[PDB]
Design a protein around this ligand. Structure first.
Ligand SMILES: *[C@@H](C(=O)OCC)[C@H](O)C(=O)N[C@@H](CCC#N)C(=O)N[C@@H](CCCNC(=N)N)C(=O)N[C@@H](Cc1c[nH]c2ccccc12)C(N)=O
Ligand SMILES: [Ca+2]
Ligand SMILES: [Ca+2]
Length: 322
């Protein structure tokens, strides 16, 4: 059983707000500018100025915590450089058991709702329960930071807020490493791989990691500053954490080709090379494999050949649990 961050007690807080006819306002991470940030998001800044804190129950008549499951399409990055965190959360959803440890069951905007939610994280060398109120940064009635592809779904916005809380502010989350969020959700062991010096069995390692629910992300180093744009000629984003979400093998003109699937935590903007959604390659696999694996949809998620992956990306991170 998780210990309470700062001694804040989810169930006692929720019950007492319900008894006293109020919704929770979190003294530890309150709905003010200092919870946004200190410089790029400080009181005196252009980003800060239009932001208003609103509850999902003030935005919409029927907000839902989880809609059609907690899945990686619910992770669409907003105007914060927390790609590393969101790639980790998207990966987290592929392992149901670890997912529902971080995101406890039973939380809702209906029965028993009192403006408070809770999540569990590996922090300070402990499993910790972190509460948040549901006041969220919004602009023109829309979430400014992470949101789901379902506009009425809130669990992922609330998780990102809890993760900001432990680090001090949303701005504190700008720039990071995927392995750090992997740890904070698992307490497990991170390893990284230099894709330019990949071992010969690297596809096997990936397949076995995916089989056992380990979390995998990848990224392209910006090796000359930002000197070709962030976006490459083949539509890949440099210095940007991607989630690795599958590895599967296809028969391409009678030969097996090893494929790998990743998702941009933007929820949009995809590889436009071979095995991309509209690439010709899919014309030349057998119909069944094609219809099991290809999804023509701008969802941020796409296939590469493993050969292309290891040429295009520079780093892979794997967090293995027990
Ligand atoms: C990603 C993002 O939000 O996309 C925007 C839409 C976000 O900018 C991000 O996390 N960037 C990372 C690189 C990509 C990843 N993950 C980043 O800026 N720095 C980390 C580098 C990881 C390895 N990079 C690549 N393979 N490309 C990093 O090490 N960050 C630091 C934290 C830090 C402290 N001060 C600065 C200043 C600039 C950048 C980062 C930092 C860390 N030790 O964790
Ligand atoms: Ca969902
Ligand atoms: Ca896609």
């Amino acid at each position: 059983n998780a210990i309470k961050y700062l001694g804040q007690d989810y169930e006692n807080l929720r019950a007492r707000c319900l008894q006293n006819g109020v919704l929770f306002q979190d003294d530890a991470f309150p709905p003010v500018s200092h919870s946004l940030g200190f410089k790029e998001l400080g009181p005196n800044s252009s980003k800060t100025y239009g932001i208003k804190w609103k509850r999902p129950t003030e935005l919409l008549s029927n907000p839902q915590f989880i809609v059609d499951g907690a899945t990686r399409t619910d992770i669409c990055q907003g105007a914060l450089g927390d790609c590393w965190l969101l790639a980790a959360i998207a990966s987290l959803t592929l392992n149901e058991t670890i997912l529902h440890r971080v995101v406890p069951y039973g939380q809702s905007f209906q029965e028993g709702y009192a403006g408070i939610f809770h999540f569990q994280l590996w922090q300070f060398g402990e499993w910790v329960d972190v509460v948040v109120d549901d006041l969220l940064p919004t602009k023109d009635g829309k979430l400014v930071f992470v949101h789901s592809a379902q506009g009425n779904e809130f669990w992922s916005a609330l998780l990102e807020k809890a993760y900001a809380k432990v680090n001090g502010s949303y701005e504190a989350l700008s720039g990071g490493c995927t392995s750090e969020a992997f740890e904070d959700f698992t307490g497990g062991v991170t390893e990284w791989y230099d894709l330019q010096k990949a071992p010969s069995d690297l596809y096997q390692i990936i397949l076995k990691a995916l089989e056992r629910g380990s979390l995998l992300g990848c990224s392209i180093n910006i090796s000359d500053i930002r000197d070709l744009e962030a976006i490459t000629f083949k539509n890949l984003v440099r210095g940007h954490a991607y989630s690795v979400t599958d590895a599967k093998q296809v028969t391409y003109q009678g030969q097996r080709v090893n494929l790998i699937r990743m998702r941009n935590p933007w929820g949009e903007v995809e590889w436009k090379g071979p095995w991309s959604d509209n690439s010709y390659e899919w014309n030349k696999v057998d119909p069944y494999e094609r219809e099991q694996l290809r999804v023509k949809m701008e969802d941020g998620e796409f296939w590469m050949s493993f050969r292309d992956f290891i040429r295009e990306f520079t780093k892979l991170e794997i967090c293995n649990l027990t």
